[model samples]
Target: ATVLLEVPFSARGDRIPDAVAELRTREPIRKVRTITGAEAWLVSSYALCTQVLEDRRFSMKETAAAGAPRLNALTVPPEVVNNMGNIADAGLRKAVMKAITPKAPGLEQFLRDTANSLLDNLITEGAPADLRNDFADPLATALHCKVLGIPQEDGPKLFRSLSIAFMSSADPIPAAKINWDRDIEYMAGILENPNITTGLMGELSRLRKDPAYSHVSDELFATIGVTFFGAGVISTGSFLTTALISLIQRPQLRNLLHEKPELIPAGVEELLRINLSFADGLPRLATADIQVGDVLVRKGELVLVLLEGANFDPEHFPNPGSIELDRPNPTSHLAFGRGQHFCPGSALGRRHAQIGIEALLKKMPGVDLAVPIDQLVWRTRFQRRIPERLPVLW
Candidate 1:
């Protein structure tokens, strides 16, 4: 019997664990114990991870079911989870896709302007500043607000509540419930006001009136609004912060990007490929027995697709440990995941980071870490790896 390795294996700096590499070599699909003490199959091979994600037989819906193995102690309300998983309502899912997708004209410019504005504030703050708080968090929250058509004035407050709700595991369930309820109540206020529901919220409101989407409730729309807002803010903030950390460590690469603006897209893709967020894995539940690599994941079993492990799989990516801007198929990384649950805000998130990084480089050519890289604190909350405070000096 294979020993079930305790999950979230520690790493040296921003790299994946040596243990993960060894396991990928020995057993790409092996049983492991989650942080919450439940047993699951950890799929590390790129091919197997892809297979499990693409196979409908393995359902995300079941992962949130009662008695399911939890990845962490954090608990969201069932309505939020159901709306997120979109278990049985294709119309609700379609409406959400419409609401979250970036369709506004000049959206890229909107992101660039938002980045520049934040960079302006960071510049005025003087030499030493925390990029995570000063730039990444605010810029991400602002973009999410713009996308959702929410008032810009409300971004900070909405983000604060969402952040606490998403990141708090102090009380886990109760704390999340408190913040979640606060966010829902806030969204309800927006829906109640005819003047406030003009952007994504308005679009969703209009859709709910359509006979085709009559089954989708106002509560569900509010849930989608808050859920999308939270997802965009948290995930993009983490990505921007992590990418900036990588650039600060590799100044020459920053210079390279500055010299050839054409490479920004490729550079962003490389950053996405090597991103350290989602360190544990994305969870799913097996509805039927499925063979992944050499192991047969039985029906009702929990499975974790270790994306970081798959991203670093040397078989698909030679010299996987190093950053390769010109690496072929850079967008093939599983950072945004794949299949039905592929991240809806992927392009928007990427554009936000690209614009944000470009603006920072153009504005602050001399930017460097205020403290030693080793002294920086890395956080591991909500299944995300981020710098607690990315302090920088320009």
Candidate 2:
């Protein structure tokens, strides 16, 4: 049954709670039309969402191929499918995975230092600041640029170029595509330089040089570099700022976390589950007829898994409305998603959020939003939900 639904993308953050609550009573999966006038399936259950993410029936590779069903045209090319969820090449995936995992002992510390330094510059400008522009956006870009070996000063410029390409409606896939093409060309030229460290980009360069993995093409290299910038920046940045806002508003919870710093880890998980950012999982096209719960997701159909809904599903999270800092099994939330399409940068993203929160709490115990809550604006156009500007004063 085709249901005419007014699921406006702009209304996403505000309407998700109601939509999920409605699904709980009526149907876990339902046919709905998106704000873009695209027909799609909206999956809301935790169990089914995980199943879809992990199951081979919903192939990200196939979904990304030429003539695949699309909620919207992707900015990047098809090679990105592998860099994203389908990193099936064993050696390449292994090399890249090593860079992201605990094997990279100093990675977390580096990110912490990076976040703090960015915060230093941010707060130096004083209060009544736009956190997105002044802090979150710059911090995220700087982190991405630094990790990928891009100069910090050029981070925002590159980010702006990429955002126009990836997020904006302007032609030529926006400036991101143009800059990404140029950036990788530059990386390729400088990859052999002795000064380059063993970060993700350097690791990718090494993997490509290996005789065993010589199949790694230039497109793959470009895809790897671009993925780090596009995916890594916004999701965690938005999550970090929103979580800060929540903590700033809820001093009781903040104090609880303060006394039991161990709870900070669990609190981060709970925060991701409740936070509006990281809510829209990803767009997937049905390759074959599949049943997600009672709903039949036919071949060639587009489906959106609401990660936030899955995390907050009462079936999985009992009394899900309440933000329980000490809740057991905090990692069960799909803030980083599940299965193959699960975030490769989950560890780094979580680390950034935790460190940012820790630093903010330690530095400004009395930190709170200076402006009225209603006066603040939230980011709506992009996939992740975040405040347009985080206004705060300590």
Candidate 3:
């Protein structure tokens, strides 16, 4: 079907709503050629997206290769992709999960304290600040470091390495290789060091010696740490910035949450669904020929599952475009994905978003956009979707 629409492959989150609306009604599974010359099917329906995501017929690891069907060149190797998902399958996932789980009770207080301290720092510096830099990034970095047992002192350095490797204009593949090596070396030192053994790194060490899952090597464990650190730091940072913008834009929603702070938890889920933070779905390759709706995807073809489309599909979410704080089926959204490859960090991510929003609402009750909405710059990156800078004020 030939459809006329402003469907720019390079457009980011800011323009996603238009594309999503058109796709939902016009072309749900449009085959579009990417700027990088990779042909991909952009799946835009709730059923089709989850079907593709959960189906074993689609291979995330194999499809994410550097030369694989990609809208933009993927920097990391296919193995690196597999390792991140696999480490979660091995005992290492549970060990890391145990270390950071909110069920610890004590860590909740620590999170609150960390959030408050960051807010205090922001307040000290004065209002009308870029929340991304002064608040969001630092809190996420500090929490990830604390969880991983990385010294607070080295947080900036490790963060820089990840930024360059993942976000910078530098050759992403080479940068990833270099950072991967440095990460392994650093993790080895941490394991060898006798000082601290209380956080995730320590848990990783303890799990390695267990006979139940002895196949796990230090390299695999380190890879898990790398994934956790990278995702934990970057996604949370991006989510906070995007959520803050959403709240600031919709004063009524912000006021409702401010008035009834208990709603923050539900608010986070709604925010997750409403905000267009991630552009493409996690890249998936077709293990075999698969039919999505009327479209037949052949083996090795890459598919881009639209996160926004799935989350807002009318079938799953009536009036999906509007933010519904009290939506009865909040969990129906696929913000964290589904099935075996679902994001393990989703629970933590939600809590972080909830707590972060709660903290911001409490600290700056009158906060709003410091600049004109049209002036705020949204980034045009491939995966993570967020503004370049969220200027806000009290």
Candidate 4:
């Protein structure tokens, strides 16, 4: 009749719940209940979080194993749980990796142009625009479209899928399936269409016919398109939106970065460190007995690694909350994560936010939240913590 210590102590993307810091010091690897009512160990200290992630004995793919306690219910095909591994098994990891790099020709310029153009329209629209919708999400959508070689017009249709696609539900979501089938079909259509001749999809289309990859499933190819776009857009979008909130709160940092501009990249790295974009401790299932902190996590147990615990740990990052640019271990934060399954889209994600913040600083130098901070509506039951709308004015 009683619920265990519920996870995700807070839904506000702007604040790291005080409970997280308490857990880090008190019981770093305490057992807690997930939204699904399943018991799991929640790792909330920097050392333990790092150990759990670095050790492969804690497996991500195994999280999809039938009847495993989950951070959230599955939304995609169970096979799609290991989509990155599936790409590797099909021997397409290199191409897929290369295709996603921020270094792709014209990609940086495209991101800059996209961010500037979005800000241009927002500026013209005058004060009190919903930055979440008008600026961040559109920039994310356009960047992914350019990266994927898909029609930019198709972005909205694909973008809509994310509201359901990234839900963190206690039970299977019916709408997730409904949206998945529709999006997958659209991606499949993209594969065969002749005009799809650039970006990741175009490269994938070529590999589909390369005979070397003739054994690859059509579903995997299609899965790549939907997954990449869904993950990229939602991730970069939410991150930029939350990051803008973080920057706006610190006028000194914002004005300093705006004046220097060259320090944007380092400032972006620090922003990534403390962004609070991830709404839940990253979930994994143990494949073997592993001693995490004082807890002996047995095989088949679910382990959630709290990223904020590590990135905000004062032991590693002194004055963890402040955006100090010259920290000795600047990139040590697990924002992108650690080990084999570290986010492949991390570089693109960073570039997306960097360009976005830079352009916004230039175009709307006086940007600030249009409404009282507490009055903002924080979205719940979604993958990333974000406001329902980020209304802002300059």
How high is the CA lDDT of each candidate model?
0.79, 0.68, 0.75, 0.92
Which 10-residue span in candidate 1 carries the lowest summed lDDT? 162-171
Q: Kindly list the per-residue Cα lDDT of model 4 for residues 191-217, writing each as its tens digit.
A: 999999999999999999999999999
Give the TM-scores of the predictions, in the order they appear. 0.93, 0.89, 0.92, 0.98
What's model 4's lDDT at 237? 96
Q: Which pairs in model 3 have colliding backbones?
A: none
For candidate 2, give the lDDT of residue 346.
83
Whole-structure CA lDDT of model 4 = 0.92
Off by over 4 Å in 2: 1-3, 8-16, 84-87, 102-105, 165-176, 190-194, 279-281
The candidate that achieves the highest TM-score relative to the unseen native structure: 4
Give the runs in model 4 whose Cα sits over 4 Å from its true position.
none
Q: What would the per-residue lDDT of candidate 1 be over residues 1-394, giving only the tens digit for each residue?
A: 8656787775223556688789899999889887677899999888988999899788877776777776665557644555555524636565556656556676778888888888888888787888998899999998888888789889898888654565523235666677777888888777766776656777776676689777767677778778888878988998888888888888899999999977888888888888886646888889998888998889888999988778889998888877788777788888899886888788887888888899999988888999988777777555577777888999
Ranking by lDDT: 4, 1, 3, 2
Candidate with maximal lDDT: 4
Regions of candidate 3 where Cα sits further than 4 Å from its true position: 1-15, 65-67, 88-90, 167-172, 211-215
How many Å off is the CA of 340 in candidate 2?
1.5
